[PDB]
Amino acid sequence: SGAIYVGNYRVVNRHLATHNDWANLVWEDSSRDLLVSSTTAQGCDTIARCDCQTGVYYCSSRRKHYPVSFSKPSLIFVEASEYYPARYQSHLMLAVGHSEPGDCGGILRCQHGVVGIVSTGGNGLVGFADVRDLLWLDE
């Protein structure tokens, strides 16, 4: 689990979104596993606007943060789940690191701010949904 709170928005994995998230829907994209809902309180997370390929993510299944090198956002094949059939998930970045399904929502940050959230993993890899291209999160 986990979310990004920026301005009047809450960013979460689309497969983990609540009934309240869907009742206050701003934007969702099944191909990215993202959903953004509106909030009453003012969020203070800073979104990174950069092309960093190094950062640190939070891994709940180890209660630890890990430094990682990660790939550029791209279309990557993802196994079927209770939420999606087998498909290419877009805007995804892979890194070598530990992850388990419940790790989804963990934040990946670089020196500029929030880069994305854990969305996929398996076999010593972890995949992050990018949020740096969503320029409107700041306006």
Ligand X SMILES: COc1cccc(Cl)c1CC(=O)N1C[C@H](C(N)=O)[C@H]2CCC[C@H]21
Q: Is 50 annotated to bind ligand?
A: yes
- Which residues ranging from 31 to 70 are in contact with Zn ion (CB under 5 A)? 48, 50, 52
State the nearest-atom distance from the C-beta of 28 to ligand X, in Å.
Answer: 13
Reference 57, options 8, 120, 10; nearest CA is: 120
Nearer to ligand X, 14 or 132 (CB): 14
Task: Record the tokens describing residue 45, joined without a space.
Answer: 């997370």
- Return residues touching ligand X (CB under 6 A): 15, 33, 78, 81, 83-84, 89, 99-101, 103-104, 118-122
Between 1 and 38, whose beta carbon lies closer to ligand X? 1
Is residue 104 flagged as an active site residue? yes
**Distance (Å, whole) CA 106 – CA 121:** 12
Smallest separation (angstroms) from ligand X to the CB of 94: 11
* Candidates 33, 59, 91, 103; catalytic one: 33
The answer to whether 67 and 57 are in contact (CB under 8 A) is no
Distance CA 48, CA 51 (A): 9
Cα 41 from Cα 37, distance rounded (Å): 12
- Span 100-119, contacts to Zn ion by CB under 5 A: 110, 112
Partner interacting with residue 50 (select from Zn ion, ligand X, none; CB below 5-8 Å by kind): Zn ion
Quote the CA–CA distance of 131 and 96 in Å, as a whole number: 20
Contact assessment for residue 137 and residue 11, using Cβ atoms and an 8 Å cutoff: yes
Residues classed as catalytic: 15, 33, 104
Residue ranges at the known binding site for Zn(2+): 50, 52, 110, 112
